[PDB]
Homo-oligomer: A and B are copies of this chain.
Amino acid sequence: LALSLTADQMVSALLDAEPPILYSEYDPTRPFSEASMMGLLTNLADRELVHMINWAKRVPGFVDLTSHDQVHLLECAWLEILMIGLVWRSMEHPGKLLFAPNLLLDRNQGKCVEGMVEIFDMLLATSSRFRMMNLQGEEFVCLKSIILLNSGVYTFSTLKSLEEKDHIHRVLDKITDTLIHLMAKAGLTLQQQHQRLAQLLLILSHIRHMSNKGMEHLYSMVVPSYDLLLEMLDA
């Protein structure tokens, strides 16, 4: 039962599910070329993908879905989930993106790739906004799980798929309750609780925009197949 958990239990599951922080390929030729930077970043994302699937299976409600729909959700969300992880890692490094512990890149180093400096500016801006809002890890892991579930749910049809959508909205309602509980426990007024909830959820639309602009720039210079995701889930 996924919809049985209390708000306090839900936070433990999400924090226990959290994937590890990984390193980039140790000691590349620095400084980077456009080819070598895209090599290291690609190397990192593909290794992070494996821990995202293991994370995804531990997110309450996800394993209850069919395998086909689990792939669909991850196929829509995987870049947004990498991006918010980056933005979260970066928080306490103003003007810098912490891709890995050994790969802290400032704004000016995005220039190497060309077109990329646009994407860096957007990722940095999101991290500034999180620093402005004083985003907490309990709130952060809740927003990641909302991205995983929400960002592919609209494209689903029979009585099976109707229940599958309804189930997802029920878990999304559960994660909303869990976000508000944390804000109430922290001692914000109801007016502030609602105001903060809205501000957090409106940042997910900017993350989607960053994801799309990111996908376009990646095709400008591969993207994860249905078979790779299914293989990683069952095995």
Q: Which residues of A contact B (CB under 8 A)?
A: 121-122, 125-126, 129, 146, 150-151, 154-155, 169, 172-173, 176-177, 180, 190-191, 193-195, 197-199, 201-202, 204-209, 212-213, 216
Q: CB-CB < 8 A to A154: which residues of B?
A: 122, 125-126, 129, 206
CB pair B155–A202 under 8 Å, yes or no, is no
Q: CB-CB < 8 A to A206: which residues of B?
A: 150-151, 154, 208
Known: A177-B191, A204-B205. A155 touches B122 (CB 8 A): yes
Query: Which of B125, B176, B208 is the one whose CB lies under 8 Å from A198?
Result: B176
* Identical chains bound together, number: 2
Q: What are 14 inter-chain pairs, A to B, with CB distance below 8 A?
A: A129-B154, A150-B206, A151-B205, A172-B199, A172-B202, A173-B195, A176-B194, A176-B198, A177-B194, A177-B195, A205-B205, A206-B208, A208-B212, A209-B212
CB pair A198–B216 under 8 Å, yes or no, is no
| 6 interchain residue pairs of minimum CB distance | A212-B212, A176-B198, A201-B201, A205-B208, A125-B154, A205-B205
CB pair A197–B197 under 8 Å, yes or no, is yes
Query: Which of B125, B180, B205 is the one whose CB lies under 8 Å from A150?
Result: B205
Q: CB-CB < 8 A to A155: which residues of B?
A: 121-122, 125
- Cα–Cα distance between A204 and B207 once the two chains are bound (Å): 12
Q: CB-CB < 8 A to A177: which residues of B?
A: 191, 194-195
Query: Which of B146, B193, B199, B207 is the one whose CB lies under 8 Å from A169?
Result: B199
- Minimum distance in angstroms from A181 CB to a CB of chain B: 10
Quick one: closest B residue to A193, CB to CB? B194
- Cα–Cα distance between A198 and B176 once the two chains are bound (Å): 7
- Cα–Cα distance between A213 and B151 once the two chains are bound (Å): 14
- Minimum distance in angstroms from A48 CB to a CB of chain B: 22
Q: CB-CB < 8 A to A191: which residues of B?
A: 177
Q: CB-CB < 8 A to A194: which residues of B?
A: 176-177, 180, 193-194, 197
Quick one: closest B residue to A219, CB to CB? B216
Q: CB-CB < 8 A to A204: which residues of B?
A: 202, 205
